[PDB]
Amino acid sequence: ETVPVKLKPGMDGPKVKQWPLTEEKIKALVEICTEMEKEGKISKIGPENPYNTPVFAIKKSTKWRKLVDFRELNKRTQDFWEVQLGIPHPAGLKKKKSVTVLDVGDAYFSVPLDEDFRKYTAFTIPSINNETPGIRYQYNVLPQGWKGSPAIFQSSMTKILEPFRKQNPDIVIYQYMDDLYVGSDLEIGQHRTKIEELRQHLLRWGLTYELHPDKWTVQPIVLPEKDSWTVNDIQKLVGKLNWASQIYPGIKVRQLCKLLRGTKALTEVIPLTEEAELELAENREILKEPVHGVYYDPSKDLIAEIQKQGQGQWTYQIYQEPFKNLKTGKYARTNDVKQLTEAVQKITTESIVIWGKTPKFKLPIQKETWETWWTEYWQATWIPEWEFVNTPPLVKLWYQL
Amino acid sequence: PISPIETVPVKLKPGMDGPKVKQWPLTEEKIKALVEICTEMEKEGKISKIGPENPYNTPVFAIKKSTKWRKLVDFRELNKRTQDFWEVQLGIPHPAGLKKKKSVTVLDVGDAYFSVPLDEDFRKYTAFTIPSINNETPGIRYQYNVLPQGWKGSPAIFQSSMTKILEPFRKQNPDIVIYQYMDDLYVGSDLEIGQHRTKIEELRQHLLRWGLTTPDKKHQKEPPFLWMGYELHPDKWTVQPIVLPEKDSWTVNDIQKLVGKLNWASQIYPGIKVRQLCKLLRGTKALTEVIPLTEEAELELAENREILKEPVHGVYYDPSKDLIAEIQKQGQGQWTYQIYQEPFKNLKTGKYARMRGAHTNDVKQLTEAVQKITTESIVIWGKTPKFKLPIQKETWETWWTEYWQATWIPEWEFVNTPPLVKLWYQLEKEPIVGAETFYVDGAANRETKLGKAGYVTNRGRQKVVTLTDTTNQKTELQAIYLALQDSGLEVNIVTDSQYALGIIQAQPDQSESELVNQIIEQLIKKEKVYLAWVPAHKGIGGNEQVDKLV
Ligand SMILES: Cc1cc(/C=C/C#N)cc(C)c1N1CC(=O)Nc2cnc(Nc3ccc(C#N)cc3)nc21
């Protein structure tokens, strides 16, 4: 018996255009969906269904996988999966030594979807050069990628894990969309052994990657240490400190400023007054410590900004109010779009672990570039929200190491 | 015939009821025409009279199409109350994505909409009334049983009806291609003309069994087909003939129509340019007003007439071979390109000329053009091409490794077809010893719109100019321009304008700002320019004392 789902009142279903797909991905999708249809998971639909969400193929393993972009449908049923049947997020997960991520999305293909809701899950396989009408389908079962699926499957998931939780009370298991996160403080061999036990529990119900959150330390704003100091070195230091002033209560820069008093050549060497090198020292102290007074607000959205540093290095900050950084980081190590796509997935994963939310990303790339290419390196089953930005020129300079 | 195909269920939008528009009284002649038109349609099953129960109504008119009469039902209110449908098709096949075909025939479905049944539960909402003479009597009241002409669901339901009918024939004949466009079927194969007009008859017979009549062999058309503005041949394709009007005087309306046909010709005729003709349309003038052609607009018009003098054709797509795309810059932010598989038999050509930004350079524009050719490729062929680009591998890397945005263009190779793409200057990475340091600053009074711009140097020079009708952004660029005029060939420049630093660090070689273009001209003459930013109003060296002056 299906759980009835409603959209938000006065909201209609998603009508999101399908991005163009290459021949290889259209052929992968057509195979996958003839086999899903013959197994009853989806059904052809007719022109009386005006809804659409996009689909992609990712090869995340040598086998193609279908990825449905339910971002829009998720926004429109947000009361159902969040306030009506929300899955609580455990604060203990981020403290564990090891966290393993398991895909349990095949679970949802056994549960039926409320038949009055199926039309909202419509999607289109396009065809090259528009030579054939798109192949159109809707779901009959809980689909992967929809946040309504884990909320409905919640009850079942807790019966499945109830024996394993009872026998291991110091293991944390958190569901987010199509994944389980499993945290322990065990040594890694015992951790892996307990993961194998858990796979056995799941296999008796049809559900056939290792983080170490304990070692996700801050990326402090770092100040140079130098033999000499030109005026140009001091101006860059004052600018970097003055901007840091806006996050770190306490930063002082009016002892370094006096040294730059007249109108001097940029390359002129300026000996540091004994006054001044206490203030580098004091602000050094400051910048290697979290922000006082910045706390995660569960009602507000998470934002992630990413800057390209060069040489395969990228910096990022997560915040809800600009300059109130909840987290800062780097990601290191080819191809700019492949690297950025990897950084977006790393930041999202940490963010799921820490807050149970994925952030909205401010991406430093042209939209059409990103939309052409992100599919070819994306390996996750979820998709965060993103927009496209132009990186302020010096924000990049102040987060460099 | 009405075909035996299952009906598509249809709903009104939620919370809404069917229409009840009242019938205007008609002329005795239109009432007579409507009664004739209605009797014959009712005979064939297209319509059915209904009792007075049905409380819905849509106005119906009749107009003299010669000496024959047309029935016009005005579904404006029912359409407004009908649910939305998936839309009929998301793009038109481009000729350049079509494969070569030995035999092609076009089939036309007769009485397309009236040959498809309407969902029994929806017919009530299509009720209409032929009024009585000077509107005395209750009129005669009908409803539709097939898809009405002019209702919102007709195109969608017809073309999915046609799709389920064809799908058998398509499975049992995988190498016959059939494209549905409204009530046309375009049919293509590689069979010999004998074996091909066989399987067309087997197709026609399969269509008759579903209540769809077609033309006989006598009415099936022959190449070269005109279609969607194109001229399709079995082995090539072009755009249908483009004629350039020789006028003494050009109206806005004439120029708009010329820009449209040049834009359309640019799909297969390489090198068509429209920038100088479009500059004339900038502004606000009536469609009837005469526009004198500037010298550059006439030189563009002349060069286009030269390109179009003899016909050009495109070839079709061989799926077994790579796509090559070449881009050339034509100047002034105009780019042109050609896609081929064998050099140089173009599948198609195009142009790119986007101001993406206020300031850019040729390297950013070339990437933008590669991105739009790439997306187009995916759509038409499902595959990205290999690019041949007029930029050195080392210019490209130099730029994109230093630049703050990410980029990724597909496999490419340099090709020496000038003008080559280059960066025209580059800022120093560290301050220049033995060069004068300018501390520039600009300021503008928001009330007054007045501003001063000026500098002071480490060598003791100083200067302040005054500006009218200005802004903080404009004075801050004026200050940098001043330092570049008065400086020698090496110079360090210290600004508190993150705005100006942002622009100049991106190495623009073209801008909409007369100022930014003068600063660029200055940056190219220099041999060395270091440019640094210092926080304003923190009493930072020369910045506080040039802040005084402005
Ligand atoms: C989109 C289209 C339009 C017409 C318009 C006729 C009018 N008016 C005719 C056909 C057969 C197609 N279709 C249907 C489809 O689904 N795929 C096709 C793949 N390849 C070709 N190639 C091709 C090559 C030469 C000629 C000629 N002469 C026509 C078509 N055509 C295709």
XYZ file of N, CA and C in Angstrom, chain A residues 12 15 19-24 46-52 124 127-131 133 136 231-233 235-236 238-239 242 254 257 260-267 308 310 314 335-337 340 363-366 368-369 372-373 377 389-394 396 398, chain B residues 8-9 83-86 90-91 93-94 97-99 156 159-160 163 179-180 356 368 371 374-375 378-382 384 400 402-408 410 430-433 437 439 456-458 492 494 498 501-502 505 530 532-535 538-542 545:
390
model
N 3.047 23.445 -8.962
C 2.875 22.410 -9.970
C 4.156 21.575 -10.075
N 8.843 21.027 -14.871
C 8.854 21.080 -16.345
C 10.241 21.547 -16.780
N 18.769 18.318 -21.132
C 20.020 18.717 -21.773
C 20.373 17.708 -22.884
N 21.052 18.145 -23.976
C 21.387 17.199 -25.050
C 22.398 16.171 -24.577
N 22.264 14.959 -25.101
C 23.125 13.856 -24.711
C 23.861 13.342 -25.941
N 25.089 12.852 -25.724
C 25.858 12.189 -26.771
C 25.230 10.842 -27.117
N 25.596 10.320 -28.298
C 25.042 9.049 -28.770
C 25.291 7.928 -27.775
N 26.501 7.860 -27.218
C 26.838 6.775 -26.302
C 25.971 6.807 -25.044
N 2.109 9.185 -22.200
C 1.612 9.851 -23.381
C 1.569 11.355 -23.221
N 1.119 12.059 -24.262
C 1.321 13.514 -24.297
C 0.528 14.257 -23.239
N -0.414 13.589 -22.570
C -1.206 14.221 -21.522
C -0.413 14.443 -20.246
N 0.844 13.978 -20.190
C 1.737 14.237 -19.071
C 2.676 15.343 -19.514
N 2.531 16.568 -19.008
C 3.405 17.674 -19.425
C 4.664 17.853 -18.579
N 4.913 16.980 -17.615
C 6.021 17.103 -16.692
C 7.303 16.523 -17.290
N 8.442 16.985 -16.770
C 9.739 16.484 -17.199
C 10.802 16.803 -16.155
N 12.511 12.050 -20.250
C 12.620 11.975 -21.697
C 13.997 11.452 -22.040
N 16.711 12.190 -28.648
C 17.319 11.482 -29.756
C 18.165 12.451 -30.544
N 19.222 11.906 -31.134
C 20.174 12.709 -31.868
C 19.472 13.433 -33.001
N 19.780 14.720 -33.150
C 19.281 15.578 -34.221
C 17.752 15.639 -34.239
N 17.106 15.304 -33.116
C 15.643 15.303 -33.015
C 14.965 14.488 -34.117
N 15.589 13.395 -34.550
C 15.049 12.662 -35.690
C 13.871 11.778 -35.303
N 10.826 11.311 -31.969
C 10.326 11.881 -30.710
C 11.043 11.246 -29.523
N 9.435 8.597 -23.678
C 8.944 9.209 -22.452
C 8.479 8.164 -21.452
N 57.975 47.166 0.498
C 56.699 47.841 0.694
C 55.580 47.042 0.023
N 55.891 46.463 -1.145
C 54.913 45.628 -1.833
C 54.554 44.397 -1.003
N 55.546 43.795 -0.326
C 55.273 42.674 0.574
C 54.406 43.102 1.747
N 52.260 45.828 1.762
C 50.938 46.164 1.234
C 50.106 44.911 1.010
N 50.694 43.890 0.398
C 49.963 42.628 0.294
C 49.657 42.054 1.678
N 49.082 43.840 4.470
C 48.007 44.634 5.067
C 46.676 44.316 4.408
N 46.660 44.203 3.077
C 45.428 43.837 2.391
C 44.892 42.483 2.825
N 43.644 42.961 6.457
C 42.447 43.789 6.504
C 41.214 43.020 6.040
N 47.374 48.298 12.497
C 47.810 49.685 12.372
C 49.222 49.862 12.925
N 50.994 49.398 9.292
C 50.602 50.507 8.386
C 51.591 51.663 8.519
N 54.534 51.828 6.202
C 54.213 52.405 4.874
C 53.687 53.814 5.120
N 54.556 54.827 5.142
C 53.990 56.151 5.519
C 54.036 57.107 4.325
N 55.187 57.222 3.656
C 55.270 58.180 2.571
C 54.778 57.585 1.280
N 55.429 58.004 0.190
C 55.113 57.448 -1.149
C 56.406 56.766 -1.600
N 56.587 55.500 -1.220
C 57.896 54.851 -1.490
C 57.829 53.878 -2.664
N 58.976 53.641 -3.299
C 59.067 52.675 -4.380
C 58.635 51.302 -3.874
N 58.001 50.522 -4.761
C 57.420 49.253 -4.325
C 58.487 48.271 -3.868
N 59.677 48.355 -4.449
C 60.744 47.396 -4.225
C 61.670 47.792 -3.080
N 39.750 28.741 -7.932
C 40.851 28.067 -8.616
C 42.165 28.731 -8.226
N 45.321 27.353 -9.239
C 46.357 26.940 -10.158
C 47.061 25.704 -9.650
N 42.752 23.999 -5.303
C 41.495 24.709 -5.209
C 41.147 24.877 -3.746
N 42.808 18.318 -15.904
C 41.676 18.965 -16.557
C 40.918 19.847 -15.565
N 40.718 21.150 -15.799
C 40.041 22.031 -14.839
C 38.638 21.540 -14.484
N 37.877 21.046 -15.465
C 36.489 20.676 -15.194
C 36.425 19.349 -14.455
N 37.374 20.360 -10.771
C 36.287 21.061 -10.105
C 35.137 20.108 -9.777
N 30.132 28.325 -8.495
C 31.125 27.668 -9.355
C 31.846 28.671 -10.250
N 33.185 28.672 -10.272
C 33.947 29.622 -11.140
C 34.182 29.098 -12.555
N 33.111 29.028 -13.343
C 33.161 28.400 -14.660
C 31.997 28.942 -15.482
N 32.139 28.903 -16.803
C 31.041 29.290 -17.672
C 29.993 28.185 -17.661
N 27.869 26.899 -19.695
C 27.724 25.960 -20.803
C 28.853 24.947 -20.828
N 30.049 25.368 -20.403
C 31.187 24.494 -20.129
C 30.826 23.441 -19.096
N 27.988 21.054 -20.399
C 28.558 20.093 -21.334
C 29.259 18.950 -20.607
N 30.141 19.271 -19.648
C 31.171 18.321 -19.231
C 30.982 17.656 -17.866
N 32.553 13.180 -15.476
C 33.337 12.855 -14.297
C 32.491 12.678 -13.047
N 29.531 31.923 -11.027
C 29.999 33.179 -10.467
C 31.314 33.542 -11.136
N 31.709 34.799 -10.970
C 33.037 35.267 -11.352
C 33.815 35.570 -10.077
N 34.908 34.840 -9.862
C 35.669 34.925 -8.616
C 36.286 36.315 -8.445
N 35.920 37.075 -7.363
C 36.519 38.386 -7.073
C 38.024 38.187 -7.203
N 38.774 39.147 -7.772
C 40.188 38.861 -8.102
C 41.073 38.524 -6.899
N 40.811 39.134 -5.744
C 41.713 39.005 -4.611
C 41.267 37.984 -3.566
N 40.684 35.060 -4.223
C 41.614 33.986 -4.582
C 42.979 34.157 -3.898
N 43.738 35.771 -1.111
C 43.720 35.718 0.342
C 43.469 34.317 0.890
N -6.443 9.170 -25.899
C -5.622 9.774 -24.859
C -6.565 10.438 -23.859
N -6.500 10.097 -22.567
C -7.359 10.782 -21.586
C -6.955 12.240 -21.430
N -5.880 21.290 -19.739
C -4.577 20.968 -19.202
C -3.458 21.221 -20.194
N -2.240 21.368 -19.669
C -1.057 21.408 -20.534
C -0.687 19.994 -21.005
N -0.103 19.937 -22.190
C 0.367 18.702 -22.795
C 1.879 18.744 -22.930
N 2.497 17.564 -23.084
C 3.953 17.531 -23.387
C 4.064 18.182 -24.760
N 10.885 18.837 -29.687
C 11.816 19.717 -28.993
C 12.874 20.318 -29.916
N 12.855 19.977 -31.197
C 13.760 20.566 -32.157
C 13.437 20.017 -33.530
N 15.092 18.437 -36.992
C 16.341 17.846 -37.501
C 17.048 18.826 -38.425
N 18.365 19.045 -38.173
C 19.107 19.911 -39.080
C 19.606 19.084 -40.266
N 22.783 16.875 -40.019
C 22.773 15.648 -39.254
C 22.106 14.492 -39.966
N 21.542 14.734 -41.147
C 20.867 13.702 -41.913
C 21.885 12.843 -42.654
N 21.579 11.558 -42.773
C 22.457 10.693 -43.545
C 22.015 10.646 -45.007
N -0.551 17.579 -30.136
C 0.136 16.606 -29.295
C -0.469 15.223 -29.453
N 0.160 13.690 -32.870
C 1.473 13.170 -33.233
C 1.845 11.976 -32.372
N 1.310 11.809 -31.166
C 1.557 10.574 -30.437
C 0.689 9.435 -30.959
N 2.515 8.220 -33.715
C 3.725 7.513 -33.315
C 3.418 6.082 -32.908
N 10.060 10.435 -40.695
C 9.986 11.596 -39.815
C 8.568 12.157 -39.855
N 7.969 12.330 -38.671
C 6.634 12.908 -38.527
C 6.743 14.421 -38.319
N 29.881 38.537 -24.792
C 29.776 37.884 -23.492
C 30.713 38.677 -22.576
N 34.640 30.653 -25.936
C 33.189 30.769 -25.969
C 32.642 30.165 -27.263
N 32.795 26.487 -27.244
C 31.752 25.913 -26.412
C 30.423 25.876 -27.156
N 30.551 23.158 -29.742
C 30.497 21.847 -29.106
C 29.057 21.449 -28.775
N 28.298 22.350 -28.139
C 26.917 22.044 -27.802
C 26.116 21.714 -29.056
N 26.791 18.145 -30.263
C 26.046 17.161 -29.475
C 24.618 17.048 -30.004
N 23.968 18.193 -30.249
C 22.575 18.179 -30.687
C 22.450 17.510 -32.050
N 23.229 17.985 -33.039
C 23.066 17.518 -34.410
C 23.621 16.108 -34.603
N 24.799 15.812 -34.048
C 25.458 14.540 -34.313
C 25.662 13.661 -33.081
N 25.409 14.151 -31.871
C 25.624 13.310 -30.699
C 27.075 13.061 -30.348
N 31.133 15.293 -30.091
C 31.931 16.515 -30.188
C 32.948 16.395 -31.327
N 45.053 29.966 -19.777
C 44.071 29.293 -18.932
C 44.659 28.745 -17.643
N 46.792 30.615 -15.804
C 46.853 31.839 -15.004
C 45.477 32.374 -14.613
N 44.461 32.132 -15.446
C 43.136 32.732 -15.298
C 42.375 32.071 -14.154
N 41.490 32.838 -13.515
C 40.842 32.316 -12.312
C 39.633 31.426 -12.591
N 39.023 31.502 -13.766
C 37.925 30.589 -14.063
C 38.478 29.296 -14.643
N 37.724 28.220 -14.457
C 38.097 26.931 -15.020
C 37.708 26.869 -16.497
N 38.452 26.084 -17.277
C 38.012 25.810 -18.639
C 38.431 24.426 -19.100
N 37.778 23.951 -20.166
C 38.108 22.616 -20.732
C 37.506 22.522 -22.137
N 37.564 20.571 -25.948
C 37.964 19.230 -26.390
C 39.209 19.191 -27.290
N 55.882 40.583 -10.411
C 56.471 41.227 -9.248
C 56.885 42.644 -9.607
N 56.965 43.538 -8.611
C 57.243 44.950 -8.900
C 58.568 45.147 -9.611
N 58.614 46.205 -10.412
C 59.716 46.469 -11.326
C 60.721 47.354 -10.599
N 61.915 46.820 -10.341
C 62.863 47.727 -9.705
C 63.388 48.708 -10.744
N 56.942 54.465 -9.219
C 55.722 53.937 -8.620
C 54.681 55.055 -8.589
N 50.991 56.093 -7.204
C 49.857 55.838 -6.321
C 48.694 56.621 -6.889
N 50.232 60.284 -7.293
C 51.476 60.846 -6.801
C 52.449 59.679 -6.785
N 53.659 60.106 -7.112
C 54.706 59.103 -7.331
C 55.751 59.156 -6.203
N 56.605 58.132 -6.177
C 57.709 58.014 -5.239
C 58.865 58.944 -5.607
N 55.191 50.812 -12.049
C 54.377 50.189 -11.025
C 53.247 51.145 -10.698
N 49.702 51.573 -8.130
C 49.057 51.107 -6.918
C 47.701 51.767 -6.877
N 39.417 47.712 -6.607
C 39.319 46.314 -7.032
C 38.581 46.201 -8.355
N 41.275 46.796 -11.006
C 42.210 45.679 -10.988
C 41.598 44.454 -11.650
N 40.342 44.149 -11.299
C 39.602 43.056 -11.907
C 39.621 43.099 -13.425
N 43.494 42.889 -14.914
C 44.093 41.568 -14.766
C 43.560 40.506 -15.740
N 53.604 46.647 -13.653
C 53.126 45.936 -12.479
C 51.996 46.747 -11.866
N 49.260 46.772 -8.573
C 48.945 46.171 -7.259
C 47.750 46.880 -6.622
N 47.047 46.188 -5.726
C 45.914 46.774 -5.022
C 46.179 46.925 -3.529
N 45.881 48.108 -3.004
C 46.067 48.381 -1.586
C 44.760 48.878 -0.981
N 44.398 48.328 0.186
C 43.155 48.704 0.869
C 43.040 50.214 1.044
N 43.099 53.045 4.586
C 43.821 52.575 5.757
C 45.143 53.308 5.925
N 45.218 54.525 5.371
C 46.439 55.340 5.518
C 47.632 54.539 5.047
N 47.571 54.049 3.809
C 48.650 53.144 3.325
C 49.578 53.882 2.364
N 50.703 54.382 2.871
C 51.692 55.022 1.988
C 51.080 56.042 1.045
N 51.583 56.096 -0.194
C 51.093 57.078 -1.152
C 49.601 57.091 -1.378
N 47.916 59.904 0.620
C 48.175 61.265 0.151
C 47.663 61.512 -1.266
